[PDB]
Amino acid sequence: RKKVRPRLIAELARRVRALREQRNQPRDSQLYALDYETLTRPHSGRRLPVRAWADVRRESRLLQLLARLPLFGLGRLVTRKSWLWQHDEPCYWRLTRVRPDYTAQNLDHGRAWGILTFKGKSEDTAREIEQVMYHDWRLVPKHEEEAFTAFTAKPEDRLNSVPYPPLLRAMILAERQKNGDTSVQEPLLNLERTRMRPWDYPAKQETKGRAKGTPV
Amino acid sequence: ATLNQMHRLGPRKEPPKRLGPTEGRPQLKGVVLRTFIRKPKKPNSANRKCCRVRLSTGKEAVCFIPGEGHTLQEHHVVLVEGGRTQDLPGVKLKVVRGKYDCGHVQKK
Amino acid sequence: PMKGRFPIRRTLQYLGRGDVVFKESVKIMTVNYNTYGELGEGARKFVFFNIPQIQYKNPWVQIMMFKNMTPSPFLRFYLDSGEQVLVDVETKSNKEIMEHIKKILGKKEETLREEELEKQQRFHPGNFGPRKYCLRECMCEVEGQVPCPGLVPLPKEMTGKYKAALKAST
RNA sequence: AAAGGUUUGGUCCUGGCCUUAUAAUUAAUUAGAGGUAAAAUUACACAUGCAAACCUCCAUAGACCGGUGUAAAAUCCCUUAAACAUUUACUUAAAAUUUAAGGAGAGGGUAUCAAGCACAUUAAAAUAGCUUAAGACACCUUGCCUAGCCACACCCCCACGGGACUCAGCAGUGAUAAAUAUUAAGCAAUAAACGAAAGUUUGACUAAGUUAUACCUCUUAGGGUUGGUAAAUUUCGUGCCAGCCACCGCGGUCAUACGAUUAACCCAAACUAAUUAUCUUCGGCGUAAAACGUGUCAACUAUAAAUAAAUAAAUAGAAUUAAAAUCCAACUUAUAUGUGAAAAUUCAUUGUUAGGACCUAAACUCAAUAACGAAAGUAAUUCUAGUCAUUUAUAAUACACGACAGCUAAGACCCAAACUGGGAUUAGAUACCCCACUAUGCUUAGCCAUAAACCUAAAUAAUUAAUUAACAAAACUAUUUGCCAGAGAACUACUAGCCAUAGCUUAAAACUCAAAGGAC
RNA sequence: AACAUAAUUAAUUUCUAGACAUCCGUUUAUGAGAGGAGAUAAGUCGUAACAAGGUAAGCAUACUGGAAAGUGUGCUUGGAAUA
Ligand code: FES
Ligand SMILES: [K+]
Ligand SMILES: [K+]
Ligand SMILES: [K+]
Ligand SMILES: [K+]
Ligand SMILES: [K+]
Ligand SMILES: [K+]
Ligand SMILES: [K+]
Ligand SMILES: [K+]
Ligand SMILES: [K+]
Ligand SMILES: [K+]
Ligand SMILES: [K+]
Ligand SMILES: [Mg+2]
Ligand SMILES: [Mg+2]
Numbered sequence A: 001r002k003k004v005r006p007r008l009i010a011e012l013a014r015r016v017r018a019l020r021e022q023r024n025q026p027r028d029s030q031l032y033a034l035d036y037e038t039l040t041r042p043h044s045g046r047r048l049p050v051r052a053w054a055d056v057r058r059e060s061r062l063l064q065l066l067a068r069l070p071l072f073g074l075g076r077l078v079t080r081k082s083w084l085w086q087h088d089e090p091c092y093w094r095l096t097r098v099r100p101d102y103t104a105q106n107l108d109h110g111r112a113w114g115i116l117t118f119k120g121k122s123e124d125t126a127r128e129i130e131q132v133m134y135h136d137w138r139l140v141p142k143h144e145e146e147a148f149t150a151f152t153a154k155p156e157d158r159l160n161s162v163p164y165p166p167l168l169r170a171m172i173l174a175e176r177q178k179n180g181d182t183s184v185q186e187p188l189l190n191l192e193r194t195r196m197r198p199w200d201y202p203a204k205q206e207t208k209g210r211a212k213g214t215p216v
Numbered sequence B: 001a002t003l004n005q006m007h008r009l010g011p012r013k014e015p016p017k018r019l020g021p022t023e024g025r026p027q028l029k030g031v032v033l034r035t036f037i038r039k040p041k042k043p044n045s046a047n048r049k050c051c052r053v054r055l056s057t058g059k060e061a062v063c064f065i066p067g068e069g070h071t072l073q074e075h076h077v078v079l080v081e082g083g084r085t086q087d088l089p090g091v092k093l094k095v096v097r098g099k100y101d102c103g104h105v106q107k108k
Numbered sequence C: 001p002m003k004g005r006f007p008i009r010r011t012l013q014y015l016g017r018g019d020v021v022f023k024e025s026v027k028i029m030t031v032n033y034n035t036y037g038e039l040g041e042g043a044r045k046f047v048f049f050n051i052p053q054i055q056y057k058n059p060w061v062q063i064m065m066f067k068n069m070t071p072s073p074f075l076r077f078y079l080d081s082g083e084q085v086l087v088d089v090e091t092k093s094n095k096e097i098m099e100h101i102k103k104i105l106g107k108k109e110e111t112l113r114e115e116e117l118e119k120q121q122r123f124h125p126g127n128f129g130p131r132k133y134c135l136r137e138c139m140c141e142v143e144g145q146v147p148c149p150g151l152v153p154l155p156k157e158m159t160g161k162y163k164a165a166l167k168a169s170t
Numbered sequence D: 001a002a003a004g005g006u007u008u009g010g011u012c013c014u015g016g017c018c019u020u021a022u023a024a025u026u027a028a029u030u031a032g033a034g035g036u037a038a039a040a041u042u043a044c045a046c047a048u049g050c051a052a053a054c055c056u057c058c059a060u061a062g063a064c065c066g067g068u069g070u071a072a073a074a075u076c077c078c079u080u081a082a083a084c085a086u087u088u089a090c091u092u093a094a095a096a097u098u099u100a101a102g103g104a105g106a107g108g109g110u111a112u113c114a115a116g117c118a119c120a121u122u123a124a125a126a127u128a129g130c131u132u133a134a135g136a137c138a139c140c141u142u143g144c145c146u147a148g149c150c151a152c153a154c155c156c157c158c159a160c161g162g163g164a165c166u167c168a169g170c171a172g173u174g175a176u177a178a179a180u181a182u183u184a185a186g187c188a189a190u191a192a193a194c195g196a197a198a199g200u201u202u203g204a205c206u207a208a209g210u211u212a213u214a215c216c217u218c219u220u221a222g223g224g225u226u227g228g229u230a231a232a233u234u235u236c237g238u239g240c241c242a243g244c245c246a247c248c249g250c251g252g253u254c255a256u257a258c259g260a261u262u263a264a265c266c267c268a269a270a271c272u273a274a275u276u277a278u279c280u281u282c283g284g285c286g287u288a289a290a291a292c293g294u295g296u297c298a299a300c301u302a303u304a305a306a307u308a309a310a311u312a313a314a315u316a317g318a319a320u321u322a323a324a325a326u327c328c329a330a331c332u333u334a335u336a337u338g339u340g341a342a343a344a345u346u347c348a349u350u351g352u353u354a355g356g357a358c359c360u361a362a363a364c365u366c367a368a369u370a371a372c373g374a375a376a377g378u379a380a381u382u383c384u385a386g387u388c389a390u391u392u393a394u395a396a397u398a399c400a401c402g403a404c405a406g407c408u409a410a411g412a413c414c415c416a417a418a419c420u421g422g423g424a425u426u427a428g429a430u431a432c433c434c435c436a437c438u439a440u441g442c443u444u445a446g447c448c449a450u451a452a453a454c455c456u457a458a459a460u461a462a463u464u465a466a467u468u469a470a471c472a473a474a475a476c477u478a479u480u481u482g483c484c485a486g487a488g489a490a491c492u493a494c495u496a497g498c499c500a501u502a503g504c505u506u507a508a509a510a511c512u513c514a515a516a517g518g519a520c
Numbered sequence E: 001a002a003c004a005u006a007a008u009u010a011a012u013u014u015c016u017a018g019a020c021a022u023c024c025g026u027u028u029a030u031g032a033g034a035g036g037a038g039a040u041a042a043g044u045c046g047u048a049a050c051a052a053g054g055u056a057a058g059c060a061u062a063c064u065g066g067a068a069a070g071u072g073u074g075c076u077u078g079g080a081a082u083a
């Protein structure tokens, strides 16, 4: 070969483009700004889904609650209106770290960290909180923490083993007879190893994407 | 040739197929420029009806008009095809009767 | 007339008659033979008749032949471990040379059959697709199944053109 | 290929062209209906509409699907490592999908592209290497590897930037082209995206519309052809005109070949024309294309023997000379010379010399011989130097040679002789014949490098029978290299090398023809 | 050009800025004018070749000429050869 010539401009463009992105990164106060009259984000002109309109006008964002508290509410408990309606058992975050967006003129946008207690079961380590820019958060009062966080676990009643599908059960029993294993035991699937979290369970904010800085 | 010589040379080199008057195309469209007579190379004797045309490619060629009697004139449009006129040397194109200005021979 | 002496050597059937398929260890086979002499006649016949057959079945093995460098002919195999297997082929017929190397460094018939079956594992007769890969392109070819509309027109009620007319009529 | 037609007065050989088969595109003429497949001038400019969303905000998707064949000899196959803009598992592993560095082997054209010019190694920083006739480099052309893959996405290879600023998504338009599908319906199926989900979205796709391009089932009948190849013509008209042919050919008054008729033949919803594609080296080289003017050294492929040379004209140098000329001298005819016959020329001639000089040039007989040398070439005598062992065949881009003619400088010069002059002949005679005289043939230096340099036989080792195309020189096997692929254009054009400059070697195409050519 | 702030949850900022413009060259098209080859095809001037073609023919080369061609030198037979 050896006629594949070098492409200096292409290499220059890639680097130059990447550099500009780092320099002109947007902030939470800009990406997540909202126009409440039209419920449309100015940065991208994305209109929020219809099912979110009522809460955007009726509920507060997390750092709107925390900006009014000393130390940005470190140690306080915060729950979500969606959890309160969906789950009877206590669901909340125990705040541990909070990085407000200083650029915001009301310090109403930022990031937070805490320890999750979902449906009465508590995680062992603190991680970043997702959906901090949602209009769904409710600060728990200090005097009501004891009654709010009181939970008694019920004995688990979800089945631990189930039958095999009709064809897959016959193929298992047939193999037994072929191999000489004589038994009338019913093949049973074990569901303990593979139990699914609820669909609304908090997800990992650290591995989540962030929107780009090109305005629409 | 020896087996070593056949190996070092391989299969016979094949001269490329040079194109003809139509340039490897079924037909071309041309505009008549002049109408004249051409004399067939001996031993034949006739006054063969031909015309010069400017083809769509931009070149100019001589085209034999078949049939007994044509109404072609300058500035007319014709559809030429391949096929040499055996007696007429250099005439490698022919006009298609019944297309554009050229028409079918009037039956007697 | 096909050129050269013994033109049968230049036929695919002859090249495929070779039976020495070397083990994966074998990497090189140097052939040292003499063009003149009496005790090297079998070696000369081995280079003439057998080296083509060996190379055909062992395309990745380097066969390099040296002439009139030593008093006697021999074969030396170089293995991937670094071992060198020297064979002395003097006073030995070309057929005897082939049999000797087959025994010491040739794959057994059992091993070769197993590799053949493994190669075809992913061909299934039931699979449908192009002729290059499959027996039947479509299920229409099978007997008892609905035939291809091109060969046999489908019933009117099985046609989208007809069904659409009814939906409009409804 | 199971072949056929066509070189001639005729036969044989060689050899090209064409015919018969198959398929696609376009065009002429012609056609009902239904089912199916496919839709295709143009990387040209694009009017309008649509082709990407989803969803309790964050995110995910819009990186796909769909399109085109832009660029690039670009690739195929295989090895290694690594991640993954992922999936599904574990706190550690199975996949799908990619990326990077590579290489067993394979991979378009031109060698008139023959040199590239840093294209290598080492690791004190030196060494001077690397690729290439086993095809480097340069240029040109092309999508290939086909369950699919690769490249491209308005242009500037790229796209920070700049610019002439976007349909190569679906439908559609302009222009252009021999080339002509709906500015359509639906997300019901499948696929993709999103969502936990009911679900939503999609010019992917599905079901339709359009079109003899193909296939299938039916119904109607049209198209071409009718000298030979090659199935099939009646009558008239025309008269080398008008026309016709794929090839050979037909037409100047009885045309089975043109036109119109008539009847037959072939195919048939088609049919014929044009264009394109499908078939591709184990054959030859005295006389038909083809053994190189000669020899030597390499690397491969083959071969297997251990010798050679041993005074007939190789070659080079020096010396030498018999015959016949030439010059000089003596004597001497009156003419001499020349042709088929003449003329001119000449009497500064002629004849003799057992007179002198010369050593220029060329070597009778032998030779009815067949030697030497690589070939070219070499034969008057003598002397000196000298040919000789590589198993054998096989070499150019290297080296050394290479008749004659020719060029360069200095000499030679008996005779011969291009040119030139004079004389004849002839219608003319820039010729054949006569006479005169140059370049030149000779020597010494150098160049030139060409021959019908032809035994028109490459070399080498076998065989002489299990063998007549013709003629020549009986046939034929094996090994290696060179060379050839219809004729002419063409010992030409261009390119490169050369002491060559009106040169040699190397060496095409357009175009024309249906033959050219060999033997009898 | 690559540092500096900050630090009793922890982060901020830097992580640059010019010049990638001409090219030296290399191909192709245009063709003043000057040539070649071929065919058209009734001609003109000679008769060079094919017969011993009426001077046997040809090769290389040189010179000469309306034109084919002529002459020289060596070579070839793809001519002849008894008086
Ligand atoms: S090919 Fe199977 S239905 Fe048509
Ligand atoms: K005629
Ligand atoms: K033939
Ligand atoms: K591009
Ligand atoms: K759907
Ligand atoms: K008649
Ligand atoms: K007729
Ligand atoms: K007729
Ligand atoms: K000869
Ligand atoms: K003559
Ligand atoms: K003559
Ligand atoms: K003669
Ligand atoms: Mg969600
Ligand atoms: Mg059409």
Ligand SMILES: [Mg+2]
Binding pocket: none
């Ligand atoms: Mg695609």
Ligand SMILES: [Mg+2]
Binding pocket: none
């Ligand atoms: Mg291209």
Ligand SMILES: [Mg+2]
Binding pocket: D112, D494, D495
């Ligand atoms: Mg050239």
Ligand SMILES: [Mg+2]
Binding pocket: none
């Ligand atoms: Mg681009």
Ligand SMILES: [Mg+2]
Binding pocket: none
């Ligand atoms: Mg465009």
Ligand SMILES: [Mg+2]
Binding pocket: none
């Ligand atoms: Mg686009």
Ligand SMILES: [Mg+2]
Binding pocket: D167
């Ligand atoms: Mg379009």
Ligand SMILES: [Mg+2]
Binding pocket: D179
């Ligand atoms: Mg079409």
Ligand SMILES: [Mg+2]
Binding pocket: none
């Ligand atoms: Mg999903």
Ligand SMILES: [Mg+2]
Binding pocket: D244
């Ligand atoms: Mg006709």
Ligand SMILES: [Mg+2]
Binding pocket: none
């Ligand atoms: Mg005919």
Ligand SMILES: [Mg+2]
Binding pocket: none
């Ligand atoms: Mg010849």
Ligand SMILES: [Mg+2]
Binding pocket: none
């Ligand atoms: Mg004269």
Ligand SMILES: [Mg+2]
Binding pocket: none
């Ligand atoms: Mg003289």
Ligand SMILES: [Mg+2]
Binding pocket: none
């Ligand atoms: Mg020569």
Ligand SMILES: [Mg+2]
Binding pocket: none
């Ligand atoms: Mg000779």
